[PDB]
Design a protein around this ligand. Structure first.
Ligand SMILES: [Mg+2]
Ligand SMILES: [Mg+2]
Ligand SMILES: [Mg+2]
Ligand SMILES: [Mg+2]
Ligand SMILES: [Mg+2]
Ligand SMILES: [Mg+2]
Ligand SMILES: [Mg+2]
Ligand SMILES: [Mg+2]
Ligand SMILES: [Zn+2]
Ligand SMILES: [Zn+2]
Lengths: 70, 53, 24, 98, 102, 53, 91, 150, 83
RNA sequence: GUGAAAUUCUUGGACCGGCGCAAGACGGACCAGAGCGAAAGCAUUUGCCAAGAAUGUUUUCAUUAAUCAAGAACGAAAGUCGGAGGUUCGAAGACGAUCAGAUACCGUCGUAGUUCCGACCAUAAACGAUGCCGACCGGCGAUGCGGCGGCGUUAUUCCCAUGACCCGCCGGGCAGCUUCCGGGAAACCAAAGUCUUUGGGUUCCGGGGGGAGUAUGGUUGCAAAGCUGAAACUUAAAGGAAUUGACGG
């Protein structure tokens, strides 16, 4: 935000992205704090959109058919 | 557009620049992710069509 | 043992037995 | 549906009407002027097909190009030999509308 | 002993149901056996809705949603507490738990 | 040009929905997407009439 | 009476060259020496003259086909593809 | 249930209790016989003759109005088909399936259906040879059956 | 109910039962007098006709075969035969 | 990337963002105790090709049927052979971690394989752990298909048809809830009921636990293996369903 302010940018569209693909679609723990910090640091907020890569169908996900055993 | 809907996006690729103006032209459009995901619901059938024209 | 692994052990032993008999 | 219809009508031309199977007899019937429909397998040699079509134009008779071959036209006639050209003297089953 | 009449899955007149991967551990689960949760969550936290709305360039801007369908194997479901073990009589009902609107 | 200005309000989807009511009722009908596949040679006069007059 | 249990046409090779090689060459030799139905005259007289050349006894038509079979699956798919591309090229 | 399907359907025809000819049926036995003769000349199988006669000419049962069944009438006049209708249609279906199968070699479902159809053909042929409708040496050959139908 | 009268079921349930499961089998179909407009002759048509029935005095269709019952063309009249 | 790391990639621009190009997989959400199929199994659009159940039927034949040793077709995945293809994933293998050890679980890479065509193999918790055909024996609300009948609403049109809903009936299905029908060792099952009040037809098949699906013979297979299949000997229990308690990282 401070770099954008000194370079002369005032508003920001938002594109939230998770890992996507055949992996998880839920955004990580940092998205909420990053967007809130951008809001509180004076930067104006415009459109917000999810751009997570969603396969119409993907290659085989890693982990095997028995998954990640823990 | 002044008072149109918000879930519609346009690509607007740039072809020619003159002076300090880049000039765009239509490249495609798409519905938004949230609108498309909200439209899909259970206990109903969706029909999808595509055509090259 | 697990029954599947007893089956596998029996199969290994049977291949060894077949090889020994074929050697004669 | 047209192919099964023409096969059924051909089957009923057999056993109920007068016909003739083969190139030489077909030409003989045409130039006698008593051939009402000439059926040609698509396997037919091009020169023979053109000549029979010209003969039919002279005789004012119809030519149907069977969508088969000589083997399948023989089968549709119910024979165990290939027929490549055939002529219907009289149908007896309204294959040829009056 | 047969624990469940439906064998823990919804397959009734099928031979084979195609598998899906557990979103938690990437285990192949039959699609009708997996626990499905369709989460429709606000794209921003309810703690940050006010800050986002104040910093918004728009006046009547409705915040977008986040639509995610989650599939769980029963192991990850039980570990993540989305489902719990129930008594022998309580296993027999299928009504989902109340939404608790108030 | 008049393809773009008529897909701006999604008139195409509206008439599709109106047409399909005699088969099965439909409610959320949109031209979900359109993508450019080929373009004709970039006439600068055509670009300038698209932008200006 | 049936004379061989499994070798068939490759009984002429005796015990030589290996069972798997004889099994491999058996189907090729059968299709090589088979007589195919001529698609021009309708008779079962189209047989191989040399490698890739198939000649019909009756209508004396000669065709360029496969090495061991009258036509290859590759060539059949190619002919279908060329027909599709032609009907797409014109309108 | 079905012979070669796991179906247990019930769709049939409920023949009415009144065997008498309806009073409004002006058609006489010889008239119905003439109609059957004309349809058989046109090439209709007895099932189609009955369907046409019931649909258009208003005769409920040819057996009720004439006293003899349609195939009996055709055989008495001498223009009955040499093969029975149902056996002819089964052989027709087998020929069609074989024609499809010689082009589609990977259609194992079609192979299975062909086996079922040919089993039905052989059972029906055994019955007809028992009844001496068919010659005692009548055999269904898959190769030669193509020229018998359609 | 343990004392249902099987010998004398009322015509309501007698009609609602399947054709074969009635006390005595009863066809649900019938025959109808059909009147094509512009024609004088009367045609006897099966209710469940599987074939396109045509007038002999005019090249016009009287019914179109459907799944269960032939659909008469519009403008054609019809009455029952002897109930 | 993980619990934390590390192996690994990075001022040679890695990751990230943008625009393109190529390839091979895969057909999300819609997707359901929904459908079809003999099962195995089957989900992008459109076309072609045959096939099929159910329904409708006052069509036809007239007992042509049910189950079936031998025999035959199909038969997930893995595996085998030949030819293409090889993006992802990933047996074997390598390394990093963890550990007392760690040939593992976790991470990075990665061969065969996974994809397609042709040919084998014929096995799965191939499951409903539940033979097929036929009859009878409760209730209820749904759902799928077909047919039939009805207030109304809706789509065009000027009206009926025809679609979409609504209320019913019938038949064939996938199931569900409930019941002192009855059965059962019980769990439970409207079939696993109509069984000492024992007989509808018919096929396969079990005889305490092990040895053992082993040895041998035969037979099938390229192989792996499949089918058929003992005995000596050993043992007083092994098992099933429920109850109480104890225990649960
Ligand atoms: Mg665990
Ligand atoms: Mg247990
Ligand atoms: Mg299974
Ligand atoms: Mg396989
Ligand atoms: Mg290979
Ligand atoms: Mg990898
Ligand atoms: Mg029995
Ligand atoms: Mg024992
Ligand atoms: Zn999981
Ligand atoms: Zn030739």
């Amino acid at each position: 935000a401070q770099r954008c302010k000194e370079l002369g940018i005032t508003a920001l569209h938002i594109k939230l992205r998770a890992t996507g693909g055949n992996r998880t679609k839920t955004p990580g723990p940092g998205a909420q704090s990053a967007l809130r910090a951008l809001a509180r640091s004076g930067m104006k907020i415009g459109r917000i959109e999810d751009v997570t890569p969603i396969p119409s169908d993907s290659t085989r996900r890693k982990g095997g058919r028995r998954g990640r055993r823990l | 557009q002044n008072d149109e809907v918000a879930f519609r996006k346009f690509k607007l690729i740039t072809e020619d620049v003159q002076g300090k103006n880049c000039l765009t032209n239509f490249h495609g459009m798409d519905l938004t992710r949230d609108k498309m995901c909200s439209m899909v619901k259970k206990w109903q059938t969706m029909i999808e069509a595509h055509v090259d024209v | 043992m697990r029954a599947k692994w007893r089956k596998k052990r029996m199969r290994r032993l049977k291949r060894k037995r077949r090889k020994m008999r074929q050697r004669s | 549906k047209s192919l099964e219809s023409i096969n059924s009508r051909l089957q009923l031309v057999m056993k109920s009407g007068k016909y003739v199977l083969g190139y030489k007899q077909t030409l003989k019937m045409i130039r006698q002027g008593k051939a009402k429909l000439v059926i040609l397998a698509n396997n037919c040699p091009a020169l023979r097909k053109s000549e029979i079509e010209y003969y039919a134009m002279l005789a004012k008779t119809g030519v149907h190009h069977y969508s088969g071959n000589n083997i399948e036209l023989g089968t549709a006639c119910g024979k165990y030999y290939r027929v490549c050209t055939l002529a219907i003297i009289d149908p007896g089953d309204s294959d040829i509308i009056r | 002993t047969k624990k469940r009449r439906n064998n823990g899955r919804a397959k009734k007149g099928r031979g084979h149901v195609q598998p899906i991967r557990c979103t938690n551990c990437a285990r192949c689960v039959p699609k009708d056996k997996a626990i499905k949760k369709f989460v429709i969550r606000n794209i921003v936290e309810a703690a940050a809705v006010r800050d986002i709305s104040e910093a918004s360039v728009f006046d009547a801007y409705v915040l977008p949603k986040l639509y995610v369908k989650l599939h769980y194997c029963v192991s990850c479901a039980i570990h993540s507490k989305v489902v719990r073990n129930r008594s022998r009589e309580a296993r027999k009902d299928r009504t989902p738990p109340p939404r608790f609107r108030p | 040009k008049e393809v773009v200005n008529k897909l701006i309000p999604d008139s195409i989807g509206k008439d599709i929905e109106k047409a399909c009511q005699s088969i099965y009722p439909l409610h959320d009908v949109f031209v979900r997407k359109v993508k450019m596949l080929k373009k004709p040679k970039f006439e600068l006069g055509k670009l300038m009439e698209l932008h200006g007059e | 009476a049936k004379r061989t249990k499994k070798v068939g046409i490759v009984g002429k090779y005796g015990t030589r060259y290996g069972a798997s090689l004889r099994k491999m060459v058996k189907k090729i030799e059968i299709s090589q020496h088979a007589k195919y139905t001529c698609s021009f005259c309708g008779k079962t007289k189209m047989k191989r003259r040399a490698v890739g050349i198939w000649h019909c006894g009756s209508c004396m038509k000669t065709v360029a086909g496969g090495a061991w079979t009258y036509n290859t699956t590759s060539a059949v798919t190619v002919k279908s593809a060329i027909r599709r591309l032609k009907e797409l090229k014109d309108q | 249930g079905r012979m070669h399907a796991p179906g247990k359907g019930l769709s049939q025809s409920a023949l009415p209790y009144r065997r008498s000819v309806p009073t409004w049926l002006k058609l006489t036995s010889d008239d119905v016989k003439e109609q059957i003769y004309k349809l058989a000349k046109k090439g209709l199988t007895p099932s189609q003759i009955g369907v046409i006669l019931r649909d258009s000419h208003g005769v409920a049962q040819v057996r009720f109005v004439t006293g003899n069944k349609i195939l009996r009438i055709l055989k008495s006049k001498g223009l009955a088909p040499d093969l029975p209708e149902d056996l002819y249609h089964l052989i027709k279906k087998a020929v069609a399936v074989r024609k499809h199968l010689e082009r589609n070699r990977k259609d194992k479902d079609a192979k299975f259906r062909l086996i079922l159809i040919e089993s039905r053909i052989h059972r029906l042929a055994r019955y007809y040879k028992t009844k001496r409708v068919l010659p005692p040496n009548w055999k269904y050959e898959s190769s030669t059956a193509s020229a018998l139908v359609a | 109910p343990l004392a249902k009268d099987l010998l004398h079921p009322s015509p309501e349930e007698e009609k609602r039962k399947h054709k074969k499961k009635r006390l005595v089998q009863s066809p649900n179909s019938y025959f109808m007098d059909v009147k094509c407009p512009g024609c004088y002759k009367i045609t006897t048509v099966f209710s469940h006709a599987q074939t396109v029935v045509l007038c002999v005095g005019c090249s016009t269709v009287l019914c179109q075969p459907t799944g269960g019952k032939a659909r008469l063309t519009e403008g054609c009249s019809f009455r029952r035969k002897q109930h």
